[PDB]
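Run log // design_07
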């Protein structure tokens, strides 16, 4: 599923991400835009052999099991394929664990390089929330 901007903002709000660990909703929409272009089915392989999955590009090196990342962890206790669903619940619940692990949203490279320090409120402007 390719979400629209305001559609995704509303879904992320319903699932508790607005101001989660102090990160306003626009931060999460901006991260999703540049990680996946709002596409739940996005995958990207990494140099070390791990793979990033879903709307927030969660990494199999630590957070999910894909059966092909030897020596990795599965800290969200899910198959990585669950992160590609049109229902974003699994991605949101895993992202909550990631953002709580000490480094905040800096875990998302695209957030650090393209959202951090910008006017992220623009990403939810005009949306009925
Ligand atoms: Cl857009
Ligand atoms: Cl915001
Ligand atoms: Cl594995
Ligand atoms: Cl949902
Ligand atoms: Cl933080
Ligand atoms: Na893994």
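design_07 sequence
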């Amino acid at each position: 599923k390719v979400f629209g901007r305001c559609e995704l903002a509303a879904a992320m709000k319903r699932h508790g991400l607005d101001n989660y660990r102090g990160y306003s909703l626009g931060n999460w929409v901006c991260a999703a835009k540049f990680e996946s272009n709002f596409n739940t089915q996005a995958t990207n392989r990494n140099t070390d052999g791990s793979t990033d999955y879903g709307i927030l590009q969660i990494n199999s090196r630590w957070w999910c099991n894909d059966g092909r990342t030897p020596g990795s962890r599965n800290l969200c206790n899910i198959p990585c394929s669950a992160l590609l669903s049109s229902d974003i619940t699994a991605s949101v619940n895993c992202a909550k664990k990631i953002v709580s692990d000490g480094n905040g949203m800096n875990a998302w490279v695209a957030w650090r390089n393209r959202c951090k320090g910008t006017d992220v409120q623009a990403w939810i402007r005009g949306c009925r929330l």
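The chain has four helices and three strands.
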